[PDB]
């Protein structure tokens, strides 16, 4: 019966197309990543893959669809893809075709958007932590999860914040803070040259660090020729309540968190955000945190985190 | 004439004739028998929530499904109540009313097989609505339930 | 002689490769968009095309190179491409091959980085101004231009700032501010529903706008069923001195500017930035503007802008 | 404010004035004694061997290093009244924008012209502060007009 009704529907839509009758493509909202262009046609957003890494087979499929439907190919600033100029008659066919090749259409609407990660550890020479696997874990746990409004997560491999962790709903940044071993330090002065923030002071036969300036890039540990700089503290630094768009809101620096802590934290922040949100599609996390208070909001997030058993 | 944005959906024949657009009008300037109709001038020319709730403008299934997280459990049953088939819908509504799960039931009754949307708060009145009406039905009783001040209902 | 010396060089590099001798790929710095990965291999950055729009012929070339050299394909957050896992022996060949197809390697080092633009007018339903042609004009005038440090420009089609104009060295955002025509407004209340910032007030048979909240998205003009809202002011709103990275600095809202004014402004901000920068590769525009003062810095930018005309 | 310590909060006032004295090092007199780095609260100074340096991205122009150098190796690079505009406190905090050094006559002219442009563009008396009017018309457009009126005074 489901197939007979769908066949009757397809027959009616084709009949309207052939007779130039009005068609409302209401079923396009059955899928994620669908938007309507200013000219009346549609665009299909492929949810960005973790780290912006795409297989040749994945890009080739997008290229085949673009040439077959004469659609324009757009690359998004979250490292996603958009196929522009799609007719309402072909939207569903393209989404299901993309779905077969693992290219989920999404990162649109009031939900968790595509997680933005930089090459990070193992790829970038400045990378301190792994960003590709963390992005995959976050994508597997929260991809397309509903929220009162868009929710964006960014994972940076180091404090240079290439993916902007300080202005994301939840921002993660790899950090490696130094400590000086006076027995090995000889005041050669090399570490002060690799520090972009100029947090280091070279004095006689030793060196110091201004921890109010140090961002934990770990360059001074890596580039010390005498191995006099050691790891004081290391890990993933977390930020919460960041946002961009109509207004800029800087996220609040929380603390270093383990991967399990990060997953628990992201889940709890979403629970407390959903509990206190009053205006879906208008209030971002930052607005809800500001209205109820950062202290009240974050202390509830902590209480729910302690209760977590899975 | 009086302009109404949903006229394109209705005049094209895409309209499902469900009657959702008319029950949401906060000015009560929309009526529904077998198709939506404006009984007064709309200052917005239909650019409002009548157009926004229409399932034929946009299904909005993706955003609703990810929140509802629907699953599928298949069963079949029959009840003591005589209905279209097993009388399951009426038996379920009777249970919800009797166990205080709902303040009223939004059901389709009939007058000479002409469908009538009704608000039922008693089980005895549920039996009169236990049968399929294949003529166009409305959701008008949901607006009546609101004017009555009912808190929870089953539709 | 140039070719004989190059042939001798290629012969020596091949001999070292075959005998597993050390090679320093010092010539990779002869090109833009080159970086060294943590594992010792290289990545080649294709300067992002305006608006993130790529022709099929262009993406196919990147795909062919990736498969030939078994390189990973990365997409950047400025809508650029990066080929990862390139050997120092193949870097030069790939750059020249990409150059032939119009894919210049760049957006790397202390220079003007790839201009970031959203679909904007004609593409996005929220677009108020054209962003693709403006991005092409800015790219043609400043692509790969040297500066004391990286310089990033972003063009947004509306005030939603998808490409972050408020945290860019120079940020452009399309704006359309409304004014109410009382003869046509009947207080239907539709405009207040399309306003995300809730700047509109519906009162009796009319409507008002709080200009301290209004961001100029123009949604209330577009979606008024009675055409009671008109354009009060329209154009490209410009921001300067913004940035992200190690620290966040919000750019300062300047004023509406014409395309010719924007090009003149970008050029003069770069001239005054270069004149006052003391530490290349450390001081961003925001740091130089803060040190000399925003008033003093912008006053000079204006003086140079007047001399152009 | 008499110095960059901003005891009367020049950065959050409609118009804020702060005394500043920026340093420059005389290498012939500097011997790297290290005393200047101790009097710097912002830690903008670097002592290296027989000399010293200043990070002008950190230096706030307090002039303590010039005053407290025992060898008179630090001299005045730049000096005067640093001006801020568009700041405020109360229901919300708005930081004023750092303009430039100004002479007393320039400060009086500037205060007058900021008030004229503020009055010209204000739409809601008793609700809109200078910062709100500057934000609505744009800082560039607002300050450009203030400068044009300042030039006409002379
Ligand atoms: C494609 C993209 C711009 C681009 O050139 O890359 C984009 C495109 C649109 N954005 Fe965006 N946004 C895009 C990244 C952003 C970003 C930055 C980011 O996410 O990394 C921002 C600001 C960062 C943030 O929000 O935290 C951004 C801020 C907005 C806003 C205002 C958000 C706010 O809360 O202030 C809207 C409209 C709204 O939410 O009311 C919006 C809405 C839109 C819409 C869907 C317009 C709309 O309301 O329907 C645009 C689709 C037009 C089109 O043709 O694609 N877009 N948008 C980006 C999609 C990335 C992706 O694949 O997911
Ligand atoms: C690829 C990319 C990350 C990504 O996943 O997309 C990236 C990658 C690197 N960035 Fe970046 N940055 C990238 C966009 C950004 C952005 C966002 C933007 O520009 O749109 C930022 C912050 C925004 C800004 O700067 O205004 C950013 C902030 C940095 C910083 C910190 C600079 C600062 O002023 O604080 C550095 C290091 C530095 O400059 O000292 C850096 C340096 C680097 C380097 C080259 C590290 C280095 O010094 O060699 C990274 C190369 C690793 C790699 O494998 O690509 N990257 N980087 C982005 C390249 C886009 C492009 O095509 O140009
Ligand atoms: C127009 C129509 C077409 C249908 N087509 C099919 C079909 O093709 N295949 C199929 O398997 N089943 C179909 N059904 C469902 C079937 O007719 C039965 O209604 C269903 O199996 C439940 O029967 P029941 O005995 O359990 O419910 P009952 O105990 O009989 O309760 C019936 C309920 O249906 C409601 N109702 C009756 N008419 C309408 C109406 N027009 N709109 C809304 N509510 C109404 C009544 O208010 C009542 O609450 C259709 C129903 C309708 C109304
Ligand atoms: S954030 Fe750090 S690790 Fe990541 S790409 Fe940028 S410089 Fe490299
Ligand atoms: S590079 Fe190492 S040995 Fe040299 S001054 Fe720095 S910490 Fe000391
Ligand atoms: S970790 Fe980085 S920011 Fe900190 S002192 Fe070392 S080089 Fe400087
Ligand atoms: S726009 Fe509002 S008042 Fe007009 S018909 Fe629709 S629901 Fe009723
Ligand atoms: S809500 Fe239902 S009855 Fe109204 S126009 Fe839409 S499909 Fe038709
Ligand atoms: S900035 Fe505006 S015009 Fe550009 S993509 Fe975003 S919503 Fe559309
Ligand atoms: S939508 Fe138009 S007619 Fe209706 S209240 Fe707003 S400005 Fe007035
Ligand atoms: S232009 Fe946009 S922000 Fe301004 S009142 Fe209209 S809908 Fe609101
Ligand atoms: S106190 Fe004077 S002499 Fe001593 S290091 Fe500083 S500038 Fe040089
Ligand atoms: S003038 Fe003050 S802030 Fe500047 S270097 Fe000297 S002591 Fe430090
Ligand atoms: O598409 S924007 O909402 O991320
Ligand atoms: O290389 S990053 O600065 O774009
Ligand atoms: Ca209001
Ligand atoms: Ca120092």
Author numbering:
A (entry chain B): 311 to 620
B (entry chain B): 1 to 155
C (entry chain A): 311 to 619
D (entry chain A): 466 to 619
Paper text:
Here, we present snapshots of this coupled system, named coenzyme F420-dependent sulfite reductase (Group I Fsr), obtained from two marine methanogens. Fsr organizes as a homotetramer, harboring an intertwined six-[4Fe–4S] cluster relay characterized by spectroscopy. The wire, spanning 5.4 nm, electronically connects the flavin to the siroheme center. Despite a structural architecture similar to dissimilatory sulfite reductases, Fsr shows a siroheme coordination and a reaction mechanism identical to assimilatory sulfite reductases.
A single-wavelength anomalous dispersion experiment was performed to solve the MjFsr crystal structure. The crystal structures of both Fsr superpose well and were refined to 2.30 Å for MjFsr and 1.55 Å for MtFsr. Since MjFsr has pseudo-merohedral twinning and a lower resolution compared to MtFsr, the latter was used for the in-depth structural and biochemical analysis. The binding of the siroheme in MjFsr and MtFsr is highly conserved. On the basis of the observed electron density, we tentatively modeled a SO32− bound to the siroheme iron (2.3 Å) in MjFsr. In MjFsr, four positively charged residues (Arg 355, Arg 423, Lys 460 and Lys 462), which are perfectly conserved across sulfite reductases, bind the SO32− and two water molecules. But both Fsr structures revealed an additional cluster ([4Fe‒4S] cluster 1), which has a noncanonical binding sequence (PCX40CX54CX2C).
